[PDB]
Curated annotation (Swiss-Prot):
The chain holds residues 579 to 646 of 1026 of the full protein. This is Maternal effect protein staufen. It is found in: Cytoplasm, Cytoplasmic ribonucleoprotein granule. Transmembrane segments: none annotated. Changing residue 54 to A: Abolishes RNA binding without altering the conformation of the domain. RNA-binding protein which forms ribonucleoprotein complexes (RNPs) that play critical roles in the localization, translational repression and turnover of RNAs during embryogenesis, neurotransmission and neurogenesis. In the oocyte, essential for the localization of both the osk/oskar mRNA to the posterior pole and bcd/bicoid RNA to the anterior pole, and is therefore required for the correct anterior-posterior patterning of the developing embryo. Association with osk or bcd at their respective poles, appears to promote the formation and stabilization of the ribonucleoprotein complexes.
């Protein structure tokens, strides 16, 4: 999930920098908000889980500037 972003993010100009800065949710849901920086703006993603936060942060990123 990260290698893919870094692939397009850098291959076009969007700086890909994944950084998990969270490990929970509102008050009932193990969701990690992984902040994935793209281009010059950040784009995090709360992946439900600890090892998922990466797949959810990136999917959120690519999906973010890959569908529009």
């Amino acid at each position: 999930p990260i290698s893919q972003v870094h692939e397009i993010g850098i291959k076009r100009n969007m700086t890909v920098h994944f950084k998990v800065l969270r490990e929970e949710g509102p008050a009932h849901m193990k969701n990690f908000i992984t902040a994935c920086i793209v281009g010059s703006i950040v784009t995090e993603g709360e992946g439900n889980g600890k090892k998922v936060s990466k797949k959810r942060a990136a999917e959120k990123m690519l999906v973010e500037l890959q569908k529009l």
